[PDB]
Amino acid sequence: ITATDVISAVNDQNAQYATGKIGEEPVTQKSPYVYSITMQGRLQNPSEF
Amino acid sequence: ENIILRTNNDGSFLRLKDVADVEIGSQQYSSQGRLNGNDAVPIMINLQSG
């Protein structure tokens, strides 16, 4: 493994965030409820690195 | 709508207009205004400090 491999892996395995919602468009069906979905691809402790 | 995604074997293309719809502005269906029980767009005018 070269250092650039470690650079490249630490770079795009400790990413950022995605967010969305279910029930944004008023069309599909009459769900009384609206939630918010989130992906977290960010590390938060030394053990995930 | 004529952005091309895949160029085909035949010589034709796969443009964006037939995997997706392209809509100008419109939107904010995440909100709605009313005026005395009637649909309306409320514009809010606001004063600069000083």
Provide the shortest C-alpha distance from residue A24 to chain B (in Å).
7
Contacts of B30 in chain A (CB under 8 A): 24
- State how beta strands B4-7 and A17-22 pair: unpaired
b or e along B21-38 (b: 16 or more beta carbons within 10 Å of the residue's beta carbon)? eeeeeeeeeeeeeeeeee
Max Cα-Cα span within chain B: 66
Contacts of A24 in chain B (CB under 8 A): 29-30
Which residues in chain A have their C atom more than 2.5 Å from the N of the next written residue, marking a break after them? Answer: none
Whether A25 and chain B come into contact, CB under 8 Å, resolves to yes
Q: Cα dist. A4→A7, A8, A9, A11, A41 in Å?
A: 5, 6, 8, 10, 21
